[PDB]
Write a protein that binds this ligand. Structure first.
Ligand SMILES: Cc1cc2nc3c(=O)[nH]c(=O)nc-3n(C[C@H](O)[C@H](O)[C@H](O)COP(=O)(O)O)c2cc1C
Ligand SMILES: Cc1cc2nc3c(=O)[nH]c(=O)nc-3n(C[C@H](O)[C@H](O)[C@H](O)COP(=O)(O)O)c2cc1C
Ligand SMILES: Cc1cc2nc3c(=O)[nH]c(=O)nc-3n(C[C@H](O)[C@H](O)[C@H](O)COP(=O)(O)O)c2cc1C
Ligand SMILES: Cc1cc2nc3c(=O)[nH]c(=O)nc-3n(C[C@H](O)[C@H](O)[C@H](O)COP(=O)(O)O)c2cc1C
Ligand SMILES: O=C1C=CC(=O)C=C1
Ligand SMILES: O=C1C=CC(=O)C=C1
Ligand SMILES: O=C1C=CC(=O)C=C1
Ligand SMILES: O=C1C=CC(=O)C=C1
Lengths: 194, 194, 186, 186
């Protein structure tokens, strides 16, 4: 089964989370995992002025989403919605919609916030779009503690706190939940698709 | 795989929908389908005064939800939320929550409204609760037309219009979508659980 | 202007928050504030088995909601929705709905939760209902903190009591809503 | 009171609705109404390839939103969210957010959709953002019809134009919001 971790990050928090999701997914024998980012929509001059972080991941096209059995979407919280960059990218999936290209495929979502507020709304409003595509939506609930690789309130998807100033980095507790999410979704993908 | 169609109905619209969901689910070889209702919370005197409809389905207990591989929830729209009866029943699932009893099981939702407004919100706010339980959420999207048994804008779950006066009954077009939802969810249940 | 603080509480957390909301609203000249609860739907036997804290505020009827200029609704988070008790109560407001009785009145929401998340969804899914009644919805913005409404964290075991800061935010919500009610209604 | 009707439209449906909203708002004595659009983010080449209807209303800056007493936001339904263009625009209001510039101002939302559903989710997920800014949210209630805000059905092929009834509801939304803006701000 093929698993895509598709993300947008301005300052690297979601990028670090994406790498954790991919790490967990890679634990599943038979899962082929790929990490890509959506295009930055800001001119590079403005992105650099704003202290945006450069990233090694390849840029996804909308059309290539059709190639995967599961897609795990990562976005920062922007006033309780997904980012404009992710929204703009998803608005380019009308062709896939019309052909049924994503119907029945697995989808799951992770996020990041400065100070917590809005994270739930970001995830559930992303689910809405995934449902228009007919995707099967995978929340994380509160999984059995022994399934997390770090011993230790986010049932919709993994999250991390960036701090009011953006300077906080994901903790190992937060990354462990992201790794669980990837492993769990990839396992489902293999169970459904081989 | 065992599939529960669990519903609340005051005037029979959701009951008719539930029967359609169950009919579709029953098409799947290997799916064992059962239909139950949540308890009425109104005293019978008031229910009868209000013109409520008597129903043959057995009354579910909260604990028995643990016995199923998939649960398809039906509720009328009450100001854009599930009914009080369904909410009250789900509030009795704390024990299941604590034990992980519903984690990873399939869930899907159908509804009914008088005049359309609120149906989307009813379904997505029901999804929230299912996600706290760790259930895998199955929207219906816009499925391939040849999969509906009646040739013919509801991607979250099947719906029906009861009319402002409650006198409209589900059309065959609406029931066909409910039947598709049951068949689709039961197929997934068998693919995951045998 | 008349302000109703209308709440459901099983273990007392929302009850404590409701008192704070009312205190804040009472700081506003011209605001007449009343605190009521929705009925418990559980038989007392089952409420007591569950370790409930018996509520003694006056019980509101669904119909009296029409008498207020602003209503501030309190509910615990129950798997990211309002409680069944609050939902059952609101399901009895169909008569008001039909008559337009709450149309244009102010509404605002506060909640309580354990440490599991869901509070944001509880508040926003409560807003949906208020909108069907045509109520004007008042979030708190950036005045487990959300801009949607005041919250308190009760702890996984329910033993935490609202913090000083959480009660201050609840007081602010009452004061702010009551002020808007007076600006609109005198 | 100053009322901004701020919209995004690709094929003209929200543009037509915005004109109606503005007409309604303009019926209110003391309301000063302005209609602006958010920038198109697509290069014109791609907008034209997609059959877009070139928009000519003045383009709003994110910062000028602070100048209004009420803002009525229009966006097409894009898989149950606002459009990427409206989202990109709102993502540029962080400077206002930090300064509290929109706090307490009135907000209301209208939308357009094909026949697929999602309009309710578009409106309510737009409300979330408005709440982060501390805006007071105005649904229309029972004054593809929703109590959340005016809508129009564009058809599966986009060829339907707003109906007379849909434009009447849009006018009502503008009139109602503008009236509340004048009651609050003169
Ligand atoms: C326009 C804008 C809106 C924001 N809205 C929120 C918010 O609603 N809640 C929050 O806690 N943080 C908010 N933030 C902080 C971002 O979520 C934070 O920068 C992001 O999670 C960092 O992830 P990244 O490094 O992957 O870009 C916002 C930031 C911006 C620029
Ligand atoms: C308290 C209450 C609230 C309602 N809210 C809505 C609503 O938000 N939207 C709507 O279109 N119909 C609404 N209705 C109509 C119900 O959805 C309708 O009675 C129901 O779908 C019938 O299903 P049933 O026969 O299975 O009970 C409401 C009815 C009641 C009693
Ligand atoms: C049925 C049920 C569901 C609950 N769901 C959640 C939840 O989704 N998230 C959460 O953090 N706490 C949850 N809780 C814990 C309650 O929110 C907490 O006990 C409640 O806020 C107490 O408020 P009260 O003392 O006013 O009743 C739940 C509790 C019950 C009984
Ligand atoms: C990316 C995209 C997603 C869409 N999603 C939906 C949808 O979820 N439901 C719907 O009924 N129509 C949907 N539509 C159709 C639009 O809502 C319709 O073309 C739009 O309302 C037109 O408004 P405008 O003319 O102002 O651009 C979508 C269109 C596009 C381009
Ligand atoms: O979903 C939840 C249920 C109960 C609780 O305490 C926390 C979260
Ligand atoms: O919001 C609504 C309430 C009741 C009804 O019948 C239709 C809509
Ligand atoms: O989800 C949808 C996408 C496009 C459209 O036209 C209708 C619905
Ligand atoms: O709503 C919010 C916006 C920005 C931020 O940094 C934190 C919260």
């Amino acid at each position: 089964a093929k698993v895509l971790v598709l993300y947008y990050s301005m300052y690297g928090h979601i990028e670090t989370m994406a790498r954790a999701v991919a790490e967990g997914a890679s634990k599943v024998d038979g899962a082929e995992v790929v990490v890509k980012r959506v295009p930055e929509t800001m001119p590079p001059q403005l992105f650099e002025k704003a202290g945006g972080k450069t990233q090694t991941a390849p840029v996804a096209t909308p059309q290539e989403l059709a190639d995967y059995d599961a897609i795990i979407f990562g976005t920062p919280t922007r006033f309780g919605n997904m980012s404009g960059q992710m929204r703009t990218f998803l608005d380019q999936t009308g062709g896939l919609w019309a052909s049924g290209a994503l119907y029945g495929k697995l989808a799951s979502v992770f996020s990041s916030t400065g100070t917590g507020g809005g994270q739930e709304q970001t995830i559930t409003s992303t689910w809405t779009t995934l449902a228009h595509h007919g995707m099967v939506i995978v929340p994380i609930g509160y999984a059995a503690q022994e399934l997390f690789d770090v011993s230790q309130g986010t049932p919709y998807g993994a999250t991390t706190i960036a701090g009011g100033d953006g300077s906080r980095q994901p903790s190992q507790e937060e990354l462990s939940i992201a790794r669980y999410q990837g492993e769990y979704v990839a396992g489902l993908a293999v169970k459904l698709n081989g």
